[PDB]
């Protein structure tokens, strides 16, 4: 079934954003593991699997709409310390959030309600789970200090 | 069976106090969750269920005595930081404790011994579990400092 | 993540409406129990738990959006007979329904699609379960008469 | 295997009658549910599944006989109250009964004994279960009055 | 251990009251069974077992206090119709309630706190279960009429 | 609860479309079975059950909104060969898709968000499962030829 | 119990027809096995068991009616290729079908309704299972070609 | 549903025949038991249960057809020795067989095909099980002599 | 929470009494074991565990009230023969009983109802179990003589 | 532990090759699914998971050696038909094979035997499983033709 | 089978290194236990078992090659504080790593590929598990400070 | 994938060596069985299965490399007594060992690292299991004498 070219193009923009989120969590989770923070490894490894599923949903929708998926991830920007990595991932999730919300409005304007619903499901994941967890960690650092926080993530 | 109007009125005063305790623990438990302190969320969520049961016992007793329950909670006074919230809940429990003890004496004076027993059961919960746990947390903060304490409640 | 002040304020308006629905079902379910209608007690006790979950969803969303939840329930208006209580609860659910629908439109206008989805989930509960059950009971009373209906709810 | 054209045509007449019986029970069962009569919903939902199987048997037999099935249901005539719906379904079953009996005689005259047996199986269902249950409900209404009857079907 | 003679004598007064409550429920439960009201038989049979336990607690306490139990039940006053029997049992429970409350005050004045606690346990049973159930049945009769109520107790 | 007449009327238009989809899959699944293609029978039998559920959702929503459901299916247009039947079902699903999308926009304009959500759930089924499967079969025929495809569906 | 001589004689005619059907399926199933078509072996082996049961029913009925069974099978006419064998079995089943239908009419004319019912059970097997399966295979060959069909029966 | 008076009357004639068959097997089975032939007791006790089911089917059909069942059994004619009882039961079953066959023809002439099918089911039981077993026992007596036969039935 | 100094002091007086009861049962139970009376060892070992729990309840309550527990047991007065030990333990329990009852009155006068309830629970244990068992043993000795009694406690 | 810069750089070259292999299998597996070839979807989905593990091994080794992983995948070159995609994946695996073999020689020359072993494990996967499977599919197409091959992968 | 004398001698050099690693972990694990760090005891106890297996592999290989194992461990150099012990073990593992890598090159030059493989297996253990874990602990100390780190190892 | 001709040729040389080892163990194991040495039969039967797997690995690798396997086993040289057979098998394993080691060096020189790894796995089996077991048996004979050794292998 042929989708609207503007919707297909924008789904492709989101797809390359999700492939990048997957890859940023791939490097960050392994960096956390390398430093001995098993709880941060486990959380970010789990998020990497979740972004792979987000990407998969977009990729499959683009194919169903007879589009050609764009498979190059956006460039990523890993941190070099725990606070920088948490900040970098939060910036990433805020960008995804804004990009999804623009896509939701676009899908409504092109009367593609199934694509809109796919994006809204990911927006809820982005706001209520991914970004929220990151905000919580930065807030825990602010309240107990970085050293106590890092001890809790061994 | 028609209860004594003074006892019914005082049970209503206690009921609105218990509905408020339930609601203060509702907001505090969710604030703790929002900040990433799962152990404080779990404890205060559990206390919210316990105050709902305390309220239920009073509400049912008022109806059995052919009274009309007052269902508006007392106003609550949530804190804005972990130490303020613990303090606010302790002040709340101390007020409940005093209110229950006055009610126990009142029920005895009106020879309503079943109502008295209902209140004494809640007084033991208030003193030996609710208030006691809060005193313990504030004492833990005093002994290990706030930052170490907050780390323990993740 | 900072939500739009108008959306946060309106979520707070809905929250105090849900806290009230919880409390109206608390008093009504216990009144039904007091009169020996176990089936009405069980149904309204279950709805009280459902409104507590509705309130919880709004409260958590307000906190996630960096708002301060308003915890005072709206005033409630319990009935004094079975038909009055059913009517009062239906009036309550119709008001909730209208309030949610206005909030859904508001969330769309502020491009807060996750908040909109939270409200739409509650709107479906309100229309297809809560209000619907109440309409059914009043219709059963109309068809078999009040006395036969009350016998069926022992 | 090529069936007799008169038998195929008459099986088609019965098929559109069975598709209609299925659809009348579809609307009636959901109307009963909408009014809170779960026992009438369950019974008529079950009959809707039984008429779907009756239709299926006729449809498959028509295809086996190298006929082309007629898939438009006959028009249906739903009631607007419980007594009218029971009456309308009984009128429907009486019509089906007569139509099946004519078909049984026709199949014998064309020496199509397998088609005859298919119809006789449905005739027994129609007389001994479908129509019989409806006669029983109308008789229960006559003996205990409509209001007591409707109470029994909640 | 020698109890206070006034307390022992009053426990004996209560014991003969409990033996009577047991016997009134014995005759009423069997009358209900004789008329075909299995639910009233089961409830009053259960209450007869509960009053036997109440009597047993008093009898054992009197012996422990080196008193001689009085074993003649008070005279009972069975009804002749369902409404009269419910009324007669409610009058019985109201009398027990008042007698227990006087005994509680007496035990306190003689500093016999264990006897007081035994009586308070029975007072809660009397008010919150025995008398309450009877009030509920009479209220159900008032709301749905006697005939519908009796049908519900088959 | 009284729905908007334009929304009720349009839900009725969709209902007769879903009843037709159910019936087209009823005849097609049995035709496939008659020819020995058990895999096509099983798939289309399953879709017939899915369209019955789609119809049921619309029918129930119309009743809840105090409308009168229209129960006559739209006319159907069965094929006479496997490729024609697949094509006819795809044309059917494309029509359903367009009709649902118009209804979604209509429900939004009348601020009936629960009806809108019911339609969006069916739109996702229509696009991502029903129509998609049919497109896949026609594409398999194009890639391996009809004869090899039909062999795979025995 | 002495049956009618014309009915006994005709049952014997059918018995020798069923013994032949058993034997034609015996040779065909083993020929299919010899060529490597396990699915055709399994199907025709199963039909051979079914014809043995058909023969058994006739043989037992003839004995019950005090007749002497004729045990020589009719001559059979096996094919030499898969299409010829399917055709030969279909011709066989069409002959059985016609012979059974004549016997059904004969049994009715001699008021032997139990014999008639035995024949009608076999007629349904013959039309709806045995002949139908063979028609389906020939139709599959027509639709996908012989080579693809034979591959599917390995 | 009102049956044809001639069919109802004839079903009543059959019903009194089946009630008699039940009663003849009641006395015969107990006579066999009294003499120590447990195998004949068990067989005839089982047949008595089967005739009770035959009677039940006729009785229920007569009521469904709005007839009044005739409940007096036909007179029975028990034997006084094992060979006489077997003979008497065979004569009974032959009479039932003939009566059922006449009823089958009558039901067809009045186009009551469900009643006809009820009778045909009983006719098969009568011919293939009840009468057949009795013929077998008499034949066993003829082949091994009465004394050896009776030994086998201990 | 700061308790009343007079209540704390009196709880301390009771605590040292309970620590002594524990220790008197420790020596007596082991003396009984040393002489071969396993049943007296088991009973007094069990009472020693019960007094340890009584002491624990008082100790914990004193700490909760911000008092400093007094941990020196009162002096104990073990017997030298079975009758002397039973007598010594009964004297001990009578003293505990009186001390608890005075404490109950004191707690009421200082409106410390939770402390009062703790004491009343122990008073019931003291009267109805500990002292009662001892009275029973001395009474058994009086009724069967010491030698028969001691034989029963091996 | 600081690795040799030339080895770290070459591991990074391999890592971006493995991230690309993962992504080419991501798009190809979903394209196969979109066309209805479930067996090709399952195989390539499984290979995508295997390349993710290959990438993970390299990424972790680079971090252990105190290098900074390069996370941008190499560009990929998806096909547009089944034969092109198989060819494109085989070209990809041949390139990986050659790149790994060069890396193995490099690791030996820098006496990094653990890195060498990591690469040799992946080389065996590449040659004996990934590339081999692709060669097999192309060979199956050559032997049975593309259409028969594609039928086998439904 | 006679091994090369230079390879046997070098395996002996490695064996005495592994016996020493076992013994250094023996003393360190017990020192950690003595200080109350159960997690460091468990880890180093596990490494002591792993070095015993490394030694065993070398010892067995030397015997298989008809060499005489050297069983004196190299001298060890335990630390006196947690940071010194971690450092001392890391220095030990770095020395083992270098010694193994030299042995791998030596085995290749003498074409003893099985001995080489034994050493490479231990080299991977040394680099990727033993040394890596130690680097991680020192890095955790650097990031959260020694005191927080030691608390985490209780 | 086309392997290097020199590597393929040498793998073929090894393959015919492994086929011979399989066959020498086939004859030796059966000779041991024939003489009553079940333990030698079981061991050499197991080695025959192991050499079949070694051959299989080489054969499959040669095919993967697009070579043509040479399937003639090398000539074998069975012994005629237990000591001769053990010696002959040890000579065989020493030859295999040397042949594998030459092949390992050859594979490295042609940069075929997967083939090298296949050979190294077999070299470890040859040295550490096959040859080692044989050396052990000859050494056991030297230490306890042949007669005692043979007794141990019954
Ligand atoms: Fe998750
Ligand atoms: Fe995402
Ligand atoms: Fe995300
Ligand atoms: Fe608790
Ligand atoms: Fe409370
Ligand atoms: Fe509280
Ligand atoms: Fe619910
Ligand atoms: Fe709500
Ligand atoms: Fe609600
Ligand atoms: Fe049924
Ligand atoms: Fe039907
Ligand atoms: Fe019907
Ligand atoms: Fe009870
Ligand atoms: Fe009582
Ligand atoms: Fe009572
Ligand atoms: Fe599905
Ligand atoms: Fe649909
Ligand atoms: Fe559809
Ligand atoms: Fe079959
Ligand atoms: Fe047959
Ligand atoms: Fe047949
Ligand atoms: Fe039977
Ligand atoms: Fe019968
Ligand atoms: Fe019979
Ligand atoms: Fe005890
Ligand atoms: Fe005590
Ligand atoms: Fe005590
Ligand atoms: Fe794999
Ligand atoms: Fe790879
Ligand atoms: Fe690969
Ligand atoms: Fe390990
Ligand atoms: Fe080591
Ligand atoms: Fe090590
Ligand atoms: Fe082995
Ligand atoms: Fe080998
Ligand atoms: Fe070998
Ligand atoms: Na700390
Ligand atoms: Na009634
Ligand atoms: Na083909
Ligand atoms: Na004999």
**Share of helix among residues of chain A?**
over 70%
Radius of gyration of chain A: 17 Å
CATH class of chain A: Mainly Alpha
Q: Count of DSSP E strands of chain A?
A: 0
Separation of the first and last Cα atoms of chain A: 50 Å
Enzyme class (chains A, B, C, D, E, F, G, H, I, J, K, L): oxidoreductase
Main location (chains A, B, C, D, E, F, G, H, I, J, K, L): cytoplasm
Protein name (chains A, B, C, D, E, F, G, H, I, J, K, L): Bacterial ferritin
Family (chains A, B, C, D, E, F, G, H, I, J, K, L): Belongs to the bacterioferritin family.
Please tell me about this protein's structure.
Chains A, B, C, D, E, F, G, H, I, J, K, L: This is Bacterial ferritin. The structure is cut from a larger assembly and holds twelve copies of chain A (154 residues). Chain A is an all-alpha fold and 154 residues long. Chain A has one domain (1-154): Up-down Bundle (Ferritin), CATH 1.20.1260. Helices cover 81% and strands 0% of the residues of chain A. Chain A has helices at residues 5-35, 38-64, 82-109, 113-144, 146-152. In chain A, α3 (82-109) packs antiparallel against α4. The longest helix of chain A has 32 residues, at 113-144. At the A-J interface, α1 and α2 of A face α1 and α2 of J. One fe (iii) ion binds at residues 18, 21, 51, 54, 96, 122, 126 of chain G.
